[PDB]
Amino acid sequence: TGLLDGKRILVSGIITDSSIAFHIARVAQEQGAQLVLTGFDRLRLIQRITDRLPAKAPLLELDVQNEEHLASLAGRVTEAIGAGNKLDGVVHSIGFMPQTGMGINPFFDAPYADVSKGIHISAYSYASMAKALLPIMNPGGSIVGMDFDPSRAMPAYNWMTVAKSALESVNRFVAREAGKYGVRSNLVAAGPIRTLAMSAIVGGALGEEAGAQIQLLEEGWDQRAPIGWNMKDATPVAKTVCALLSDWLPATTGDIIYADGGAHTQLL
Amino acid sequence: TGLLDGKRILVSGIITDSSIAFHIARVAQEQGAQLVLTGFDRLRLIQRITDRLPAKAPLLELDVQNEEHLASLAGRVTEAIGAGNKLDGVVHSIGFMPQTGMGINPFFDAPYADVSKGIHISAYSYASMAKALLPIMNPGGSIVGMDFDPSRAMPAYNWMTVAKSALESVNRFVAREAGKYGVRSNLVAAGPIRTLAMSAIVGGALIQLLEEGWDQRAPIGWNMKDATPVAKTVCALLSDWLPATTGDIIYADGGAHTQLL
Amino acid sequence: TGLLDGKRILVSGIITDSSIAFHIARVAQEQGAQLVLTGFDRLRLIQRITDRLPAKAPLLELDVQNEEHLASLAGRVTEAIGAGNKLDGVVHSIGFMPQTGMGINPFFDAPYADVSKGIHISAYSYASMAKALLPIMNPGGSIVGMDFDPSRAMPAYNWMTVAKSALESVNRFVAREAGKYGVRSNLVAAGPIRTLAMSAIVGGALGEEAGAQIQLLEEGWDQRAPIGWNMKDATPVAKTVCALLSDWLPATTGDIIYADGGAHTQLL
Amino acid sequence: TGLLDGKRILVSGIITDSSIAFHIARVAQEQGAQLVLTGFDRLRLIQRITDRLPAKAPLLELDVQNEEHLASLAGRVTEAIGAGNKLDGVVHSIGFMPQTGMGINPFFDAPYADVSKGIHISAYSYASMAKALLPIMNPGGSIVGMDFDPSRAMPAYNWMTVAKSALESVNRFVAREAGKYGVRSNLVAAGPIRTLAMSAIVGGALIQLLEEGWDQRAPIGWNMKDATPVAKTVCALLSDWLPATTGDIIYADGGAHTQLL
């Protein structure tokens, strides 16, 4: 009776109740999904946060840079959902980039070690998770990652833009591997959403003027989006992710769905 | 239980039970929609076809090159669904290109009158239907058209490739208009499907090699005789589950377009 | 010494001295090219215009909607350049769209008859000219058309945007035909240039604050463009066309070169 | 007379006389450029290769993973062309990916340490060199890097494809910076060319079929054994004849990427 009814889905990337992952988790559960959650580093906090989700779901630790976490991942998921059950869905909502690689910090000044950390967490880990989880996914399954359209450069996004371009390429190759399991792999390219990560970043760049520029970003995005855009609401993005986790897009893989109000299809 | 529960949706393009529009209509009815169908030219023939759909639905004549048909359409639709009710969905699943514009016929030999007719039916008509039906569409509604990825030239598709390129551009402008009504506009780029147009327009102007090639490039495979995955994709767009996508193209092609070999 | 030394190039599209084609013609001549020119309708006026070019050049009438003009073109060109001589280059710098298909006139209110004529002249005729001239082109030859990037919708450009999308598609097919002859076919996507088509034709469709809307277009373009953009200067565009007419892009065909200051590569 | 007469141009990436950089260098010199060359690893062996060039040019050492090399680059480059002289061109023609990231080795088995090294050398180093060399570039100058179209996935190319996607994105940011110096930044996406990297990196990770399919898809054909058309394109970008193109990608692939089949 729900869009994701009877589906077991892993969701990564909850850190705050504003996280896009949190809303993906909320909407999936509203649509009848049974979730496993993964969290990085602050697991007591994430536990308290996810108490506020509609239903109780098991939380597993996963630092995508930790090889041991990746190697034990499938075993721990299987334990969490019960032996014999497989995942129908996997959500990658994970991103990171050192401040040097962001903002008004000069593009040329980011040291490779910083960039490389960012790309490891933001792009490579999409292949890492897929590698760890594909052997426990059902045919008809769906892996989804979060994207921010990096086809053109822009202020501030800097090296994360580069990491997303890498992510887009990784996704196309994940699809080749995933297809062997009858599993789809796609990205959702979202417009700007007022998550705490989003606001910290622009705030890290512009400081005292960050609040104003954020309101201006919202105005510009809403104007260019033919159906408009609400930065305060992650629901449309979360629904798009759930659509890809459902069986209603069975012939789409290696691809990118734009949940950005249609802004990227307009010049002005 | 139903992805499109309660929605009122107009579906154009049904001519046989292999039509992508037929499968779109079937699946939508299965998912709780109520349809109004439109047919070009063969009304008695289409009526027999549509009698095979899981539920009966009113059938309206529509020639997209006929100005009077377009002018009467909204009123005719309202008459069929009852005053005070509006559409939630519109499906544009039509196209045509004269033989000279297709297959092994030389690209340079297609006369403009031929090309022009093809573009009228396959691309302009998307704006035309939108112009006619937007005044009777509900907020949150959705207009969906059928595309075949024309970003790179290819044998056989010739001038229809040009018509599809125009359509994609048209779709982005319809989205600006449709947005004023709170309505989305998108295309589904489908992989090759065994339809009347496939056999009679394309094949008539010349396929097994095409199925194999497409199935190879597609990471999850491709079945030319199964329009259902395409139909489901259109339904996804007609649903409330892709509420932030407009002016866009969704690829229901097995992932073929994301792979070089 | 000259980039196009010894080459024989047909240039269409000159109507005023602000025409992109006029500057393409000037620079080509400065680079040692020998030219044949084509003009539509106002041929006395055009001839007065072309007298201001650095060098003499035959002027032939060509209305791309006139089948008879198209059928006699090769013969009139060959008569102009001498028998046993062929063209090395062809420039299509031709566009048209009735006022109804542009500006603040509603997108839905443009009749297909208006749009169709616009597509005939702006898109289909690229195939027409190629059909007429390919039999009189040397291997190593080059056909170039003028584009305005239509991959995203925008205010005002309206149905001309659709024509340009059609033209891009046509160019990919012309490339397959031209290939047999060892001839390249490409488009130059220029940024906005203050020709009279811009200021008067598009400008006239813009309503009351037309000038301001066009200046705003320039400011936005200059800003997005990493090297900036000057709407008053067609020379970077004319040079780019000449680059495609030269032997220095011998492996590029069916393609688009962006002479737009790099604006299309930047979101903001 | 020469396309690049009096232009001072740095060219990285020569390792054998099949290198794309070697042919870029050869064509630039034929067109009157004064070159400075950089090499990695076996510089004495590279010197033997660079001696085969038309004119003798200074060879400097540059490992792009070496912060000292990068920090001293401009100083050493200035020493080579003379104090008071600046560069007009910079050619980035380098890249690398460990075997684990290539060919028949499973995509999922490449350790990040390996991928990272490949991304560092192949993509980040484009920004690295720009940062080092922009302060000694004249207005009107041109930075060019080599690309292989990564917009779709493909067998064998694997993680290098990902590095190329990074590079394309890096190029767009390098353009923003280079613009402040009146300098252009672009990539050339080349078709397949028989080089040491083609043979040792890609080939050992596994060939003739690649050439045929590319030549078939290219409207003007394509020759894997001929790097000259690619070198010419790079020189076009180094010249004054593409002065309005930046942050972009020019395809020197025989038009292959514009055709489905």
Ligand SMILES: NC(=O)c1ccc[n+]([C@@H]2O[C@H](COP(=O)([O-])OP(=O)(O)OC[C@H]3O[C@@H](n4cnc5c(N)ncnc54)[C@H](O)[C@@H]3O)[C@@H](O)[C@H]2O)c1
């Ligand atoms: N907020 C937006 O506007 C926006 C727009 C488009 C795309 N995105 C993408 O959506 C996803 C989530 O972003 P968000 O806006 O919700 O911010 P967020 O801070 O809520 O989510 C980012 C997540 O990455 C996790 N993470 C960081 N390092 C990790 C590691 N080593 N191992 C495992 N997890 C790690 C964090 O703990 C966090 O949960 C990202 O991929 C982001 O780039 C965000």
Ligand SMILES: NC(=O)c1ccc[n+]([C@@H]2O[C@H](COP(=O)([O-])OP(=O)(O)OC[C@H]3O[C@@H](n4cnc5c(N)ncnc54)[C@H](O)[C@@H]3O)[C@@H](O)[C@H]2O)c1
């Ligand atoms: N079969 C495929 O492989 C495939 C792949 C991608 C996209 N498409 C697209 O899907 C849509 C439907 O095509 P199909 O494959 O189902 O073939 P089809 O023959 O089953 O449907 C084509 C329809 O166009 C309608 N039509 C033609 N002229 C008309 C007019 N003047 N006014 C109103 N309607 C008119 C026909 O009556 C018919 O029902 C088209 O837009 C087509 O290009 C088909």
Ligand SMILES: NC(=O)c1ccc[n+]([C@@H]2O[C@H](COP(=O)([O-])OP(=O)(O)OC[C@H]3O[C@@H](n4cnc5c(N)ncnc54)[C@H](O)[C@@H]3O)[C@@H](O)[C@H]2O)c1
């Ligand atoms: N001005 C810009 O900003 C700009 C930007 C990108 C692309 N373009 C393109 O460049 C080309 C030239 O436009 P322009 O800006 O130089 O304005 P323009 O008016 O000087 O050039 C347009 C030309 O088309 C010719 N033409 C119209 N109908 C014709 C027909 N039936 N047969 C033969 N010729 C015909 C006109 O006579 C004229 O010479 C067009 O294709 C246009 O779309 C212009």
Ligand SMILES: NC(=O)c1ccc[n+]([C@@H]2O[C@H](COP(=O)([O-])OP(=O)(O)OC[C@H]3O[C@@H](n4cnc5c(N)ncnc54)[C@H](O)[C@@H]3O)[C@@H](O)[C@H]2O)c1
């Ligand atoms: N050969 C092809 O088919 C082809 C096609 C398209 C694009 N490309 C690209 O063109 C460029 C040249 O490659 P190629 O085909 O000529 O092979 P190549 O082997 O002749 O050149 C590759 C170069 O990378 C250099 N390099 C590796 N690590 C380095 C480091 N740490 N610091 C500085 N330089 C380093 C090598 O020493 C070498 O000279 C590359 O970026 C490549 O990816 C090659």
